[PDB]
Amino acid sequence: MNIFEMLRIDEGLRLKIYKDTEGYYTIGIGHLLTKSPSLNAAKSELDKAIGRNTNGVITKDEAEKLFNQDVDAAVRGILRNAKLKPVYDSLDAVRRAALINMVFQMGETGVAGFCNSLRMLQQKRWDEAAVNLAKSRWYNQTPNRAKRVITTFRTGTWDAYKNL
Numbered sequence: 001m002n003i004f005e006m007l008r009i010d011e012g013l014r015l016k017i018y019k020d021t022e023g024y025y026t027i028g029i030g031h032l033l034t035k036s037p038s039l040n041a042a043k044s045e046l047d048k049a050i051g052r053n054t055n056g057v058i059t060k061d062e063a064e065k066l067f068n069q070d071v072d073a074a075v076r077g078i079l080r081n082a083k084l085k086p087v088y089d090s091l092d093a094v095r096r097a098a099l100i101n102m103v104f105q106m107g108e109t110g111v112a113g114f115c116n117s118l119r120m121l122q123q124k125r126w127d128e129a130a131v132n133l134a135k136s137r138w139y140n141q142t143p144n145r146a147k148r149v150i151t152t153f154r155t156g157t158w159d160a161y162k163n164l
């Protein structure tokens, strides 16, 4: 397991524009296009992102290209953020993947707002951090995914992604 395989499990792979868990137009491996409710605005975002006139469908290779860009972007957003960088640096490689996963799903700003959780992770109080991470809109709206990410932070293992 690694961050790409982990997010591929959590986000799936769909080659046609679809609505994510929040109702927002998305494509590929969890690539958010727009929060606009207009499908035409989502198709324009897709065409800009891929560099061609797509009308809403992409190839697997194109989905994987956006995914590489999005993982890179989540890591660089962590390292550019004064709240997230020190936490990332303090973690082992498995827990770093969990933090990348959360930033991929909810964005740099969203995760950096989890101050109490981030502090417990920096302190390596893993069970306390896990309890605290579950007290969130995130957990309530995507509980199975959040449980997998939280088990990853609690244990520093990939056990929640095994048999997936």
Ligand SMILES: *SCC1=C(Br)C(C)(C)N(O)C1(C)C
Pocket: 115, 116, 119
């Ligand atoms: S991370 C939120 C905060 C905590 Br736990 C203490 C240390 C009490 N603070 O002063 C805040 C609000 C920064």
